[PDB]
Amino acid sequence: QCDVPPNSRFDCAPDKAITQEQCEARGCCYIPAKQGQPWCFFPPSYPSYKLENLSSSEMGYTATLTRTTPTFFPKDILTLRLDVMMETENRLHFTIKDPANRRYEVPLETAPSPLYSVEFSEEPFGVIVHRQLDGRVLLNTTVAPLFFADQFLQLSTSLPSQYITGLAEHLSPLMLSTSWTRITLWNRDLAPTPGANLYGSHPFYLALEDGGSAHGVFLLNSNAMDVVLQPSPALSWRSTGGILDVYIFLGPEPKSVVQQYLDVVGYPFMPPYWGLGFHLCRWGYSSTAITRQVVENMTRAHFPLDVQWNDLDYMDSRRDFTFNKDGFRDFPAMVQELHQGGRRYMMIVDPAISSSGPAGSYRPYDEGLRRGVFITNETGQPLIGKVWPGSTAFPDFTNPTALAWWEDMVAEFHDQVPFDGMWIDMNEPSNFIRGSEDGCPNNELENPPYVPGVVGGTLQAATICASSHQFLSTHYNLHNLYGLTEAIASHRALVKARGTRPFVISRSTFAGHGRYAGHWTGDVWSSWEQLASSVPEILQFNLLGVPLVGADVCGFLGNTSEELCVRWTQLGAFYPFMRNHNSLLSLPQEPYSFSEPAQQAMRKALTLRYALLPHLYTLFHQAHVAGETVARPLFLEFPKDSSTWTVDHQLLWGEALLITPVLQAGKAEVTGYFPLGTWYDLQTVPIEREPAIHSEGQWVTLPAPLDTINVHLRAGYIIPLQGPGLTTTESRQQPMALAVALTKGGEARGELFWDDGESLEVLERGAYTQVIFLARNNTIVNELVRVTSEGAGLQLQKVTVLGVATAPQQVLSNGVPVSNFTYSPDTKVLDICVSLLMGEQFLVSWC
Ligand SMILES: *[C@@H]1O[C@H](CO)[C@@H](O[C@@H]2O[C@H](CO)[C@@H](O[C@@H]3O[C@H](CO)[C@@H](O)[C@H](O[C@H]4O[C@H](CO)[C@@H](O)[C@H](O)[C@@H]4O)[C@@H]3O)[C@H](O)[C@H]2NC(C)=O)[C@H](O)[C@H]1NC(C)=O
Ligand SMILES: *[C@@H]1O[C@H](CO)[C@@H](O[C@@H]2O[C@H](CO)[C@@H](O[C@@H]3O[C@H](CO)[C@@H](O)[C@H](O)[C@@H]3O)[C@H](O)[C@H]2NC(C)=O)[C@H](O)[C@H]1NC(C)=O
Ligand SMILES: *[C@@H]1O[C@H](CO[C@@H]2O[C@@H](C)[C@@H](O)[C@@H](O)[C@@H]2O)[C@@H](O[C@@H]2O[C@H](CO)[C@@H](O)[C@H](O)[C@H]2NC(C)=O)[C@H](O)[C@H]1NC(C)=O
Ligand SMILES: *[C@@H]1O[C@H](CO[C@@H]2O[C@@H](C)[C@@H](O)[C@@H](O)[C@@H]2O)[C@@H](O[C@@H]2O[C@H](CO)[C@@H](O)[C@H](O)[C@H]2NC(C)=O)[C@H](O)[C@H]1NC(C)=O
Ligand SMILES: *[C@@H]1O[C@H](CO)[C@@H](O[C@@H]2O[C@H](CO)[C@@H](O)[C@H](O)[C@H]2NC(C)=O)[C@H](O)[C@H]1NC(C)=O
Ligand SMILES: CC(=O)N[C@@H](CS)C(=O)O
Ligand SMILES: CC(=O)N[C@@H](CS)C(=O)O
Ligand SMILES: [Cl-]
Ligand SMILES: [Cl-]
C-alpha cells in the first residue's frame, strides 16, 4: 500500500510539520526521503470522493461526488456536483461545485469529433482526458485524492512531459522546474526575485507533448493558491477558496493552445500606434523645466521619443489627481506643448486615496467617501492603510459606484491636464503596513487553515486585510483581481475622457488582463542577471495574452553601467512595450547621458525599432484579431524541433524575425539556436558576418560586438518598414519599404495592417487597409484585401530582396525599368528604388 515510487508521492502533510505517528494516524504513508519530496504521502487507498449517478446530456455530463471519510482540513464539503461541458472541438470545460451553497466564482464574461475524449474513474474519483489522435493521456485527476473543503481545494493530475510553462508572475526560466517546485499565486509588491509570489497571478499552464503537440489548462480561480510540480511528472492545484472551474485547450499546436485560452479570457487590446514608440521616465524629474529638458536633450541628440512620462513628482504631496504649484505649476502647459510637438504624455496613478486631509479639501477622497467607493472594514468604515501620501483608503473596483467615481476623477483631471494614458502602479494593492492602521481581526479569512507559500507567511503581508469588504465579495476572494479590476475601470475611464483607444500600463495583473491593458515587469535591478531574465518573462506574458509587455530598459533599481545600458537598449528595442524608467536614487540613464559610441549604438537600436513599427503594429493587429503572440519563444513557432523547447534567451517577433541578444558583460559574440532554414542578417537591408545563415537546425556562434545586436529574417517572409522620425507622428508620414526574404525556390509572403492609429472600433467599422505581399518567380506583387481612406497615400519607395543568387540585367516596376537598383554579389541583395502605393496593385519583376 505504501510502495509508491519517490517521484509519485503526493504530500499528505501540506499544512504542517508532521511526525510518523500523526502521518499514519491520518491514514498516510511515512517514508523518509534519502536526502521537496514529501515524507508523508497518500497511499492509493486514501479516501477521496466517489462518482455516483453519472448522466449524459447534449452539453456533456453531470454527476454527484461523495466523500465518506473526512480529510484533515476543517469543513469538507461532502457532497459535490460535477458538470462536464464539451464546449467546442478544442475546448473542454468542467466544474466541481457545492450544489447546496453558492460559492465565490470569478467574474468573467462568456472528421467531425472533438480533439479530446473524456472518461471517469469511479472510486477514487478522477477525470481523464485523452488526445484522440494519438491516445496520449493529458489530464488524469485520479492520481491523487480530490480535496474540497471550504478553504482548501486540491486537484492533481499527471503531466504528459517534463515541459510546462505559465503560472505567472514569477522570475523563472520559461520552462518551469518539475523538481518539487511550489509556485505561489498571491499578488504582492516585491522587487522581482526567484521563488517569490510577484505582482500578478495567472493560473494557466501550457504543457508540451512528445512530438510537438501541446495542450493548456486554465483554473478559473482567483484565491491565494500554490501550484505544486513534481518530477513523475505531475501537478497539484491547491487553492484557498472558490470552486474548481477548469478549462482544457487541445491545440494541437502551441500557438493554437494560446489562441484557445484567449478565446476564453479575451484577445489582447489593440494599442494606439504611438504606444509602440519609445517611452522615457524616471522618479526624480522634479519640475516641468527638468521634464522639458529630457525631450530637448533627446531631440538634440537625434533620439526618437514618442512619450514623456512622470512618476510621483508631479503630484501635490504625493496625491492622485493633483499637481504641485512649485515645480509643476505650469503642468497643463507642459503637456499641451508636448502635444504641439507630436508627442504624448503619461503619468503615474496610484489606487489608494489620501484620507487625512481636512474634510472638504480633497475632492477624490471627499467624493469617494460620500458615494461609498472604498473597501470597508468590520464596522463598515473605510479600511485605512499607508502608501505614498500617508494614510489612505482603497477604492473597491468591483463596486459600480466606484467605477463611476473613477471615471469622474479621471475626466476631471484630464480637463486640467490632457494626459494620454494611465500608468497604474501599487495595485496589488500595496500597503506599507500590515493589513490596516487598525490591524486585522481574528477570523478564518485572516488566519486560514492553509496558507500558501507567500512571502511574509501571511495573506496580509504588504497588503490589506483579507476579511475586508468589497461589493462582490471579501478581499480574500478578490485580491488577485484588484489590479485587473482597476485596469478595467481605467480602460473605461480613458475611453470616456478621450474618445480614442486607451493606453493603460499596469503593475498587478490577473488572467485576462491583456484584453484591457499592458504590463511592465516592475522594480527590476540594473543587473546582467535581470536583463537576461527579462527575456523569458516577456515571452511568458505573451503566452498569457499580455503582449504589450516590457521591462524597465537599463533596469530600475541601482545604477546601470554604460555597457549594460547598451545591451539592455538593444534587447529592449524588441520588447513590445519599450520604456526606460529609473529610480529616484539612481544615476541618470537616458540615452543622451552616455558616451558617443554608446549613444550611437542606442540610436541604432531605436532607429531600427522605429523602422519596424508598421510590422510590429501588424503583429499587434494579429494578436487582437486572432489571439496570436507578438514576442514568441522559438518553441511556439517550431514546436516539432525539440531543441527549441528550452530556448528562452532568444525571441521571435511573429513568425519571421529572430533576435539573439548578448546578455552578459564582456561578450563580443553570442551563440544562438537557428531552426532549419535560411536566416538572413537584417543588417543587409539598407536603413536610413555572413549575409545568410544556412541552418540544419543547429546552434551558431555569431559576432556580436558592443555596437551590434543580431537580428535575422526568416526566408519566406516579407516585412513592411517605414522611414525615420523622432516621433510616430512624424514617422507615419514617411515613405515605406519592403524587405523580401526569398526561399531558395524564390517564394515569400507578408502583410501590412494600417489604420489611423488611435480610433475606437476600427475593425467593426472597417476603417482600415490590409495588404498582402507575395514574391514568386522573380516577381513581387501586392494583394488588396481591404483598401480604405486610412491606407491611401502610403508610398512604397524601396524594395530590398534578399537571396537573389544572380545579378539581374533588368528590374521592372509595372512594366517600366526602375529609376535605379543595386545588386551586391557578396550579400546576394537586390535593392530597388520604386514609386508605388501600398493601396494600388503593383508588379515588380527582375531577370
Ligand atoms: C475601521 O476603520 C476605521 C477608520 O475608517 C477605524 O477607525 C479608527 O479607530 C481607532 C480606534 O480604534 C481610532 O484611533 C483613536 O483616535 C483617537 C483620536 O485621534 C485617540 O484618542 C484614540 O486613543 C485611544 O486609544 C489609545 C491606544 O493607543 C489610548 O492610549 C487612548 O487613551 C484612547 O483610548 C485612538 O487612537 C482612529 O482614529 C480611527 N481612525 C479614523 C481615521 O478615524 C476603525 O478602528 C476600524 N475598525 C476596525 C474594527 O478595525
Ligand atoms: C490515471 O491514474 C490512475 C491512478 O494512478 C491510474 O490507475 C491506476 O493504474 C495502475 C497501473 O495500471 C493500477 O495499478 C495496477 O493494478 C493492477 C491490478 O490490481 C496490478 O496488477 C498492478 O500491479 C498495478 O498495481 C491501479 O490500480 C490504478 N488505480 C486506479 C484507482 O484505478 C490510471 O491508469 C491512469 N489512467 C490512464 C488512462 O492512464
Ligand atoms: C443517485 O440517484 C438515486 C436515484 O435518484 C432518483 O432518480 C434520479 C434520476 C432523480 O430523478 C432523483 O430525483 C430520484 O430520486 C438516489 O436514490 C434515491 O434516493 C432518494 C432519497 O434518498 C430515495 O427516496 C429513493 O428511494 C432513491 N432511489 C433509488 C432507486 O435508490 C441516490 O440517492 C443518488 N445518489 C447520490 C449519492 O446522490
Ligand atoms: C548609485 O550611485 C550613487 C552615486 O554614486 C556617486 O556618483 C557617481 C557619479 C560615481 O562617481 C560613484 O562612484 C559615486 O559614488 C550612490 O549614491 C552615493 O552613495 C555613496 C556611498 O553610500 C555616498 O557616499 C554618496 O553620498 C552617494 N551620492 C549620491 C549622489 O547619492 C548610490 O549609493 C548608488 N546606488 C547603489 C545601489 O550602489
Ligand atoms: C540636458 O542636457 C543638459 C546639457 O547637457 C544638462 O545640463 C548640464 O548638466 C551638467 C551635469 O552633468 C551640468 O554640469 C551642466 O552645468 C549643465 N549644462 C547646461 C548647459 O545646463 C541637463 O542636465 C540635461 N537635463 C536632463 C533632464 O537630462
Ligand atoms: C499632430 C500633433 O502635432 N499632435 C497631436 C498628436 S500628439 C495632438 O495634438 O494630440
Ligand atoms: C541564467 C542563464 O541560463 N543564462 C544566463 C547566464 S548562463 C545568460 O543568458 O547570460
Ligand atoms: Cl518523527
Ligand atoms: Cl461570496
Side-chain angles (χ1 to χ4, degrees):
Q1 66 191 227
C2 292
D3 182 33
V4 178
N7 290 348
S8 300
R9 293 171 191 174
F10 287 89
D11 190 2
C12 172
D15 57 315
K16 61 183 279 208
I18 200 168
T19 71
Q20 171 165 16
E21 190 164 356
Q22 293 168 319
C23 177
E24 291 173 352
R26 284 182 174 191
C28 289
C29 297
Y30 182 86
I31 301 175
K34 297 192 171 167
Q35 67 292 310
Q37 175 186 129
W39 292 29
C40 183
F41 63 94
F42 300 119
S45 59
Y46 184 89
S48 189
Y49 287 75
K50 175 171 178 190
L51 176 94
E52 311 196 70
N53 292 342
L54 178 70
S55 77
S56 178
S57 82
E58 67 266 41
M59 283 200 85
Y61 299 96
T62 187
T64 297
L65 309 181
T66 307
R67 172 173 280 288
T68 316
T69 305
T71 72
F72 46 85
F73 285 104
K75 293 176 168 156
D76 286 307
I77 300 169
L78 304 173
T79 299
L80 306 169
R81 201 211 315 276
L82 174 65
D83 293 290
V84 183
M85 283 74 64
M86 299 168 80
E87 289 186 349
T88 76
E89 71 164 7
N90 307 315
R91 183 171 73 242
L92 179 62
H93 181 199
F94 69 88
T95 61
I96 299 172
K97 294 182 185 167
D98 180 355
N101 301 101
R102 181 203 57 77
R103 290 178 60 78
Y104 168 75
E105 288 183 55
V106 179
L108 181 62
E109 192 195 338
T110 62
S113 184
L115 298 197
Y116 51 87
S117 69
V118 57
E119 311 166 353
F120 313 92
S121 168
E122 192 169 21
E123 193 177 23
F125 165 69
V127 180
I128 299 102
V129 181
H130 285 92
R131 182 173 299 287
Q132 294 265 61
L133 186 57
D134 55 17
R136 191 175 304 280
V137 177
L138 305 186
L139 195 82
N140 181 357
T141 77
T142 318
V143 298
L146 168 64
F147 279 54
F148 203 116
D150 192 41
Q151 292 179 261
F152 186 85
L153 313 188
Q154 191 180 275
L155 185 72
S156 305
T157 180
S158 56
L159 291 169
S161 82
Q162 298 294 337
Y163 298 88
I164 176 167
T165 188
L167 307 172
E169 187 167 21
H170 307 85
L171 205 66
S172 144
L174 189 57
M175 289 298 157
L176 307 174
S177 172
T178 58
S179 302
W180 305 107
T181 304
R182 180 172 66 172
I183 302 173
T184 303
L185 276 58
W186 180 249
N187 293 356
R188 165 67 187 255
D189 179 353
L190 186 71
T193 186
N197 53 307
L198 308 179
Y199 309 108
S201 291
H202 297 249
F204 169 82
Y205 70 79
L206 181 156
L208 285 169
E209 300 162 33
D210 186 52
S213 292
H215 71 280
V217 177
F218 176 41
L219 174 60
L220 178 59
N221 181 294
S222 62
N223 289 92
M225 74 167 76
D226 278 335
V227 183
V228 178
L229 307 183
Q230 62 195 78
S232 52
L235 174 151
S236 304
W237 302 95
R238 214 181 266 169
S239 182
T240 56
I243 66 164
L244 297 166
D245 187 342
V246 178
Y247 292 88
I248 306 94
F249 307 105
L250 268 288
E253 308 87 356
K255 286 185 290 184
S256 297
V257 173
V258 167
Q259 174 264 125
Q260 288 152 17
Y261 168 54
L262 301 183
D263 276 349
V264 167
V265 298
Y267 287 178
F269 87 103
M270 189 71 188
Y273 198 97
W274 59 258
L276 302 189
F278 186 48
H279 302 260
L280 189 54
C281 193
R282 81 170 291 169
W283 195 335
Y285 297 146
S286 56
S287 66
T288 56
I290 290 171
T291 302
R292 283 188 181 97
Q293 289 181 0
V294 176
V295 173
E296 171 180 4
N297 287 2
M298 289 286 282
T299 299
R300 161 182 275 285
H302 309 284
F303 289 109
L305 174 67
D306 265 77
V307 194
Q308 179 62 52
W309 296 41
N310 287 287
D311 207 310
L312 291 187
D313 299 271
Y314 76 86
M315 294 173 184
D316 189 289
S317 311
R318 302 187 165 193
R319 295 178 299 170
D320 282 343
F321 310 119
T322 67
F323 61 93
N324 69 72
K325 306 306 191 277
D326 299 322
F328 281 78
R329 180 182 287 284
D330 64 331
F331 195 31
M334 185 187 77
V335 177
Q336 293 163 7
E337 290 158 16
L338 281 165
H339 291 164
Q340 284 155 31
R343 290 182 179 80
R344 274 73 181 194
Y345 181 76
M346 288 284 282
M347 78 299 166
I348 200 159
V349 179
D350 298 316
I353 302 295
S354 174
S355 63
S356 61
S361 71
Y362 181 54
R363 181 170 161 81
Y365 183 69
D366 302 328
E367 268 295 286
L369 208 58
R370 180 181 75 73
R371 300 176 76 180
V373 308
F374 297 118
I375 294 182
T376 55
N377 67 10
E378 185 167 47
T379 53
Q381 290 96 45
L383 182 149
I384 306 302
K386 291 286 198 177
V387 209
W388 300 120
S391 294
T392 59
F394 299 81
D396 171 13
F397 295 102
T398 72
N399 182 346
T401 302
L403 299 183
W405 161 86
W406 192 246
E407 292 163 1
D408 292 349
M409 296 305 99
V410 165
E412 289 170 18
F413 197 50
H414 189 266
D415 291 339
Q416 296 195 259
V417 182
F419 53 86
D420 298 300
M422 288 170 69
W423 169 24
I424 59 176
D425 194 22
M426 307 305 286
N427 58 348
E428 293 73 29
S430 178
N431 193 6
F432 293 170
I433 53 172
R434 182 186 67 84
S436 81
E437 292 190 337
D438 305 286
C440 301
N442 183 15
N443 61 52
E444 290 170 325
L445 301 181
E446 308 290 355
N447 302 304
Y450 180 75
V451 184
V454 300
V455 170
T458 178
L459 297 181
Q460 300 84 24
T463 194
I464 64 177
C465 300
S467 63
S468 60
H469 171 90
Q470 306 192 228
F471 182 83
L472 289 184
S473 192
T474 48
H475 195 68
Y476 180 89
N477 292 316
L478 293 168
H479 174 86
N480 283 344
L481 312 182
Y482 191 90
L484 171 67
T485 61
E486 184 189 18
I488 294 170
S490 300
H491 185 281
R492 292 175 182 167
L494 288 162
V495 165
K496 293 181 162 173
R498 299 178 72 251
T500 56
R501 270 173 232 181
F503 194 70
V504 178
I505 300 291
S506 182
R507 199 164 74 175
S508 184
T509 66
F510 189 79
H513 185 86
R515 182 177 185 196
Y516 304 97
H519 177 57
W520 91 110
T521 58
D523 293 350
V524 302
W525 285 89
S526 298
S527 73
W528 291 95
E529 198 170 36
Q530 290 274 355
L531 167 60
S533 285
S534 75
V535 188
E537 189 157 31
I538 270 49
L539 293 179
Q540 187 67 275
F541 274 94
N542 272 259
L543 299 184
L544 295 168
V546 190
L548 185 68
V549 60
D552 292 339
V553 175
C554 304
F556 178 70
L557 296 176
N559 299 314
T560 197
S561 68
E562 178 164 294
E563 192 190 359
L564 174 60
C565 198
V566 167
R567 296 308 199 186
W568 210 322
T569 303
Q570 283 167 345
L571 168 81
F574 290 94
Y575 291 155
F577 173 61
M578 190 195 184
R579 177 181 75 142
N580 180 317
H581 172 49
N582 194 22
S583 78
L584 184 56
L585 297 169
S586 306
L587 292 159
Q589 61 188 43
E590 303 88 3
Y592 58 77
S593 78
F594 295 99
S595 74
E596 189 56 36
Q599 288 193 42
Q600 288 171 7
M602 291 170 192
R603 194 174 301 107
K604 179 159 65 142
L606 288 158
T607 291
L608 174 55
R609 177 191 185 81
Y610 275 67
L612 286 164
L613 285 184
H615 181 54
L616 184 58
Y617 195 68
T618 301
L619 295 176
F620 269 100
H621 166 72
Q622 292 304 317
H624 173 60
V625 80
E628 291 284 333
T629 54
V630 172
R632 72 181 63 152
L634 276 55
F635 87 80
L636 234 70
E637 189 59 31
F638 304 91
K640 296 179 176 169
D641 179 353
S642 65
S643 299
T644 70
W645 288 12
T646 57
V647 176
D648 60 6
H649 292 118
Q650 291 167 276
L651 66 160
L652 294 159
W653 267 14
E655 293 165 68
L657 282 173
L658 181 59
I659 305 116
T660 308
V662 168
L663 301 169
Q664 307 173 257
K667 301 289 182 182
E669 56 179 32
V670 64
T671 299
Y673 189 76
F674 285 78
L676 168 79
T678 293
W679 294 89
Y680 300 101
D681 196 316
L682 196 63
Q683 291 207 286
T684 63
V685 178
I687 302 292
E688 310 296 289
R689 187 169 305 285
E690 296 299 332
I693 291 161
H694 300 103
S695 175
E696 296 293 353
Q698 65 199 90
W699 293 88
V700 181
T701 300
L702 310 159
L706 184 51
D707 68 16
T708 296
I709 180 164
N710 279 273
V711 184
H712 289 82
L713 174 57
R714 186 176 176 186
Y717 291 83
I718 301 175
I719 304 305
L721 307 162
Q722 187 161 40
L726 301 184
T727 72
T728 60
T729 304
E730 179 179 17
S731 70
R732 286 173 56 88
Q733 300 177 65
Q734 302 307 313
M736 295 189 148
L738 297 175
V740 179
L742 297 179
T743 60
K744 185 182 179 183
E747 294 269 301
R749 174 191 190 284
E751 59 194 292
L752 175 68
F753 170 87
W754 197 260
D755 66 9
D756 72 11
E758 46 192 331
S759 284
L760 294 168
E761 297 178 0
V762 163
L763 302 188
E764 177 173 19
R765 295 175 302 112
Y768 67 91
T769 292
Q770 172 110 79
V771 180
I772 293 169
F773 308 104
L774 300 169
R776 167 168 284 171
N777 199 16
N778 289 22
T779 76
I780 296 159
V781 300
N782 58 338
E783 175 184 311
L784 307 169
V785 178
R786 183 170 179 81
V787 175
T788 58
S789 61
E790 285 83 17
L794 282 182
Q795 296 162 68
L796 166 62
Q797 101 162 353
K798 183 65 78 81
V799 175
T800 308
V801 191
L802 311 182
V804 176
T806 66
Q809 291 177 342
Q810 66 160 18
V811 179
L812 304 179
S813 175
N814 290 340
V816 177
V818 296
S819 60
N820 74 310
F821 69 88
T822 71
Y823 178 73
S824 158
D826 294 349
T827 59
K828 274 45 166 182
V829 176
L830 173 61
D831 196 33
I832 309 169
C833 296
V834 299
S835 300
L836 296 171
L837 296 165
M838 289 298 201
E840 308 206 335
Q841 288 201 69
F842 66 75
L843 168 66
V844 171
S845 69
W846 61 95
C847 63

PDB file of all heavy atoms in Angstrom, residues 377-379 381-382 384 438, ligand 1:
ATOM      1  N   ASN A 377     -14.131  47.990   6.463  1.00  0.00           N
ATOM      2  CA  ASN A 377     -13.771  47.016   7.459  1.00  0.00           C
ATOM      3  C   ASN A 377     -14.986  46.504   8.238  1.00  0.00           C
ATOM      4  O   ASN A 377     -16.130  46.729   7.851  1.00  0.00           O
ATOM      5  CB  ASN A 377     -12.673  47.588   8.361  1.00  0.00           C
ATOM      6  CG  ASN A 377     -13.149  48.748   9.227  1.00  0.00           C
ATOM      7  OD1 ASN A 377     -14.344  49.051   9.333  1.00  0.00           O
ATOM      8  ND2 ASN A 377     -12.186  49.412   9.847  1.00  0.00           N
ATOM      9  N   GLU A 378     -14.717  45.803   9.333  1.00  0.00           N
ATOM     10  CA  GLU A 378     -15.721  45.076  10.099  1.00  0.00           C
ATOM     11  C   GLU A 378     -16.861  45.968  10.572  1.00  0.00           C
ATOM     12  O   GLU A 378     -18.019  45.547  10.606  1.00  0.00           O
ATOM     13  CB  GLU A 378     -14.993  44.460  11.293  1.00  0.00           C
ATOM     14  CG  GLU A 378     -15.760  43.541  12.206  1.00  0.00           C
ATOM     15  CD  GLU A 378     -14.798  42.786  13.121  1.00  0.00           C
ATOM     16  OE1 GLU A 378     -13.895  43.444  13.706  1.00  0.00           O
ATOM     17  OE2 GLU A 378     -14.925  41.544  13.231  1.00  0.00           O
ATOM     18  N   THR A 379     -16.536  47.212  10.910  1.00  0.00           N
ATOM     19  CA  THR A 379     -17.528  48.134  11.411  1.00  0.00           C
ATOM     20  C   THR A 379     -18.196  48.949  10.305  1.00  0.00           C
ATOM     21  O   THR A 379     -19.121  49.715  10.561  1.00  0.00           O
ATOM     22  CB  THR A 379     -16.931  49.009  12.538  1.00  0.00           C
ATOM     23  OG1 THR A 379     -15.728  49.643  12.105  1.00  0.00           O
ATOM     24  CG2 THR A 379     -16.584  48.138  13.717  1.00  0.00           C
ATOM     25  N   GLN A 381     -16.573  51.091   8.144  1.00  0.00           N
ATOM     26  CA  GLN A 381     -15.851  52.289   7.774  1.00  0.00           C
ATOM     27  C   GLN A 381     -14.743  51.948   6.792  1.00  0.00           C
ATOM     28  O   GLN A 381     -14.368  50.792   6.677  1.00  0.00           O
ATOM     29  CB  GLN A 381     -15.228  52.949   9.001  1.00  0.00           C
ATOM     30  CG  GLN A 381     -16.248  53.562   9.925  1.00  0.00           C
ATOM     31  CD  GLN A 381     -16.606  52.631  11.042  1.00  0.00           C
ATOM     32  OE1 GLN A 381     -15.729  52.012  11.649  1.00  0.00           O
ATOM     33  NE2 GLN A 381     -17.899  52.527  11.336  1.00  0.00           N
ATOM     34  N   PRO A 382     -14.221  52.957   6.087  1.00  0.00           N
ATOM     35  CA  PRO A 382     -13.122  52.691   5.172  1.00  0.00           C
ATOM     36  C   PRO A 382     -11.913  52.066   5.872  1.00  0.00           C
ATOM     37  O   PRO A 382     -11.502  52.500   6.950  1.00  0.00           O
ATOM     38  CB  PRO A 382     -12.769  54.072   4.622  1.00  0.00           C
ATOM     39  CG  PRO A 382     -14.015  54.872   4.784  1.00  0.00           C
ATOM     40  CD  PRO A 382     -14.654  54.366   6.036  1.00  0.00           C
ATOM     41  N   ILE A 384      -8.232  51.868   6.357  1.00  0.00           N
ATOM     42  CA  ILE A 384      -7.177  52.842   6.151  1.00  0.00           C
ATOM     43  C   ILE A 384      -5.827  52.139   6.240  1.00  0.00           C
ATOM     44  O   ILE A 384      -5.520  51.483   7.237  1.00  0.00           O
ATOM     45  CB  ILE A 384      -7.264  53.998   7.194  1.00  0.00           C
ATOM     46  CG1 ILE A 384      -8.660  54.642   7.186  1.00  0.00           C
ATOM     47  CG2 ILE A 384      -6.194  55.050   6.942  1.00  0.00           C
ATOM     48  CD1 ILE A 384      -9.108  55.204   5.859  1.00  0.00           C
ATOM     49  N   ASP A 438      -5.363  49.784  11.812  1.00  0.00           N
ATOM     50  CA  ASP A 438      -6.031  49.208  12.973  1.00  0.00           C
ATOM     51  C   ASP A 438      -5.864  47.695  13.031  1.00  0.00           C
ATOM     52  O   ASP A 438      -6.606  46.997  13.725  1.00  0.00           O
ATOM     53  CB  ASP A 438      -7.490  49.644  12.920  1.00  0.00           C
ATOM     54  CG  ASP A 438      -7.615  51.162  12.823  1.00  0.00           C
ATOM     55  OD1 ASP A 438      -7.386  51.841  13.854  1.00  0.00           O
ATOM     56  OD2 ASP A 438      -7.890  51.701  11.719  1.00  0.00           O
TER      57      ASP A 438
HETATM   58  C1  LIG B   1     -12.400  50.571  10.716  1.00  0.00           C
HETATM   59  O1  LIG B   1     -11.762  51.664  10.129  1.00  0.00           O
HETATM   60  C2  LIG B   1     -11.864  52.873  10.884  1.00  0.00           C
HETATM   61  C3  LIG B   1     -11.328  54.026  10.045  1.00  0.00           C
HETATM   62  O2  LIG B   1     -12.112  54.184   8.880  1.00  0.00           O
HETATM   63  C4  LIG B   1     -11.121  52.730  12.217  1.00  0.00           C
HETATM   64  O3  LIG B   1     -11.182  53.976  12.894  1.00  0.00           O
HETATM   65  C5  LIG B   1     -10.082  54.205  13.794  1.00  0.00           C
HETATM   66  O4  LIG B   1     -10.366  53.731  15.104  1.00  0.00           O
HETATM   67  C6  LIG B   1      -9.321  53.973  16.036  1.00  0.00           C
HETATM   68  C7  LIG B   1      -9.769  53.418  17.382  1.00  0.00           C
HETATM   69  O5  LIG B   1      -9.971  52.036  17.225  1.00  0.00           O
HETATM   70  C8  LIG B   1      -9.026  55.474  16.149  1.00  0.00           C
HETATM   71  O6  LIG B   1      -7.915  55.721  16.986  1.00  0.00           O
HETATM   72  C9  LIG B   1      -8.246  56.630  18.058  1.00  0.00           C
HETATM   73  O7  LIG B   1      -8.040  58.012  17.730  1.00  0.00           O
HETATM   74  C10 LIG B   1      -8.393  58.911  18.805  1.00  0.00           C
HETATM   75  C11 LIG B   1      -8.312  60.378  18.374  1.00  0.00           C
HETATM   76  O8  LIG B   1      -7.269  60.566  17.410  1.00  0.00           O
HETATM   77  C12 LIG B   1      -7.499  58.633  20.014  1.00  0.00           C
HETATM   78  O9  LIG B   1      -7.852  59.475  21.117  1.00  0.00           O
HETATM   79  C13 LIG B   1      -7.673  57.178  20.425  1.00  0.00           C
HETATM   80  O10 LIG B   1      -6.826  56.865  21.541  1.00  0.00           O
HETATM   81  C14 LIG B   1      -7.349  55.740  22.282  1.00  0.00           C
HETATM   82  O11 LIG B   1      -6.529  54.590  22.167  1.00  0.00           O
HETATM   83  C15 LIG B   1      -5.216  54.746  22.674  1.00  0.00           C
HETATM   84  C16 LIG B   1      -4.424  53.468  22.409  1.00  0.00           C
HETATM   85  O12 LIG B   1      -3.175  53.800  21.846  1.00  0.00           O
HETATM   86  C17 LIG B   1      -5.270  55.074  24.166  1.00  0.00           C
HETATM   87  O13 LIG B   1      -3.964  55.306  24.643  1.00  0.00           O
HETATM   88  C18 LIG B   1      -6.140  56.304  24.417  1.00  0.00           C
HETATM   89  O14 LIG B   1      -6.322  56.515  25.800  1.00  0.00           O
HETATM   90  C19 LIG B   1      -7.502  56.152  23.744  1.00  0.00           C
HETATM   91  O15 LIG B   1      -8.300  55.214  24.439  1.00  0.00           O
HETATM   92  C20 LIG B   1      -7.377  56.257  19.243  1.00  0.00           C
HETATM   93  O16 LIG B   1      -6.013  56.355  18.825  1.00  0.00           O
HETATM   94  C21 LIG B   1      -8.724  56.079  14.797  1.00  0.00           C
HETATM   95  O17 LIG B   1      -8.671  57.482  14.903  1.00  0.00           O
HETATM   96  C22 LIG B   1      -9.830  55.708  13.816  1.00  0.00           C
HETATM   97  N1  LIG B   1      -9.434  56.172  12.506  1.00  0.00           N
HETATM   98  C23 LIG B   1     -10.021  57.174  11.868  1.00  0.00           C
HETATM   99  C24 LIG B   1      -9.475  57.510  10.510  1.00  0.00           C
HETATM  100  O18 LIG B   1     -10.976  57.800  12.334  1.00  0.00           O
HETATM  101  C25 LIG B   1     -11.703  51.547  12.985  1.00  0.00           C
HETATM  102  O19 LIG B   1     -10.925  51.224  14.121  1.00  0.00           O
HETATM  103  C26 LIG B   1     -11.713  50.312  12.064  1.00  0.00           C
HETATM  104  N2  LIG B   1     -12.363  49.208  12.753  1.00  0.00           N
HETATM  105  C27 LIG B   1     -11.750  48.056  12.997  1.00  0.00           C
HETATM  106  C28 LIG B   1     -12.541  47.005  13.723  1.00  0.00           C
HETATM  107  O20 LIG B   1     -10.596  47.821  12.640  1.00  0.00           O
END
